[PDB]
Design a protein around this ligand. Structure first.
Ligand SMILES: *C(=O)[C@H]([C@@H](C)O)[C@H]1CC(SCCNC=N)=C(C(=O)O)N1
Ligand code: NA
Length: 268
């Protein structure tokens, strides 16, 4: 059984790395391909920035937001890990689209907060999840405190299956116009923060786009999509490994990518 091998190999990683590994792989309609701890809650950390960009694109599509609108700010908006926001600070603004692209591709925290200050805060992010049929994911705080990942805390959490289904809805389920869908996919493919994580464990000819997270208490996450030949999949990986070094956590997620690959290749 290929799925048994998948389970066994993930459990071996968990045992040997003292880790918990949550995975869900779904088809474009949200049908389950495979998973592990798929309905256990994990901190979303920065992975929520992909749904945040989807919310922004939905508003742009609808006309309730404009991509070129300038969002002014001062140094009050700079928080830890805000590389683009810092570079644009002297100019005094970033556009909605600039901020969204920095949030997705650099995991820029200041840019994320700038967009949260606009779209209606964590309450509004959570309402977007509900609107697209995700009753599980919840944002309660802004960056970087939303990544505190206190054990057992249900604030700022999702489950692998809820998030994978949200990704599928956004990319394949008609949440966005064809243009906006294509754009967000290109942003995920061109992500600058994921070279050592999930995509490092996939075949080099798969088209892969993803959004990473790194948070306190050993959280290391990666969500997105992959196309294996003509077959599209949405995937969410959430891991907790407090005893591993940062480099080892990257390698753990890459290893999960390999386990996913073995399953997909072996099931034809
Ligand atoms: C998201 O998961 C966090 C946020 C909670 O702060 C950001 C920070 C990082 S890693 C920090 C070091 N980065 C570059 N030197 C990420 C990430 O995506 O890995 N997201
Ligand atoms: Na200020």
């Amino acid at each position: 059984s290929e799925k048994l091998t998948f389970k066994t190999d993930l459990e071996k990683l968990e045992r040997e790395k003292a880790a918990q590994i949550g995975v869900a792989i779904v088809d474009p309609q949200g049908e389950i391909v495979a998973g592990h701890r798929m309905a256990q809650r994990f901190a979303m950390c920065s992975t929520f920035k992909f749904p945040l960009a989807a919310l922004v694109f939905e508003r742009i599509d609808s006309g309730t937001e404009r991509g070129d609108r300038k969002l002014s700010y001062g140094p009050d908006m700079i928080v830890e890990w805000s590389p683009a926001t810092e570079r644009f600070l002297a100019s005094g603004h970033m556009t909605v689209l600039e901020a969204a692209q920095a949030a997705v591709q650099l995991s820029d925290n200041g840019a994320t907060n700038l967009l949260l200050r606009e779209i209606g805060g964590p309450a509004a992010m959570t309402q977007y999840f509900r609107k697209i049929g995700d009753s599980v994911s919840r944002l309660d705080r802004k960056e970087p405190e939303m990544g505190d990942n206190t054990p057992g805390d249900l604030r700022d959490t999702t489950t692998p299956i809820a998030m994978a289904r949200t990704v599928a809805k956004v990319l394949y389920g008609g949440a966005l116009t064809s243009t906006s869908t294509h754009t967000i996919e290109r942003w995920l493919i061109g992500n600058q923060t994921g070279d050592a994580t999930l995509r490092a464990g996939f075949p080099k000819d798969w088209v892969v786009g993803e959004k990473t997270g790194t948070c306190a208490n050993g959280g290391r996450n990666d969500i997105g999509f992959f196309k294996a030949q003509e077959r599209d999949y949405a995937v969410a990986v959430y891991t907790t490994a407090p005893k591993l070094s940062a480099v080892e956590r990257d390698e753990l997620v890459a290893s999960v990518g390999q386990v996913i690959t073995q399953l997909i290749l072996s099931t034809d």
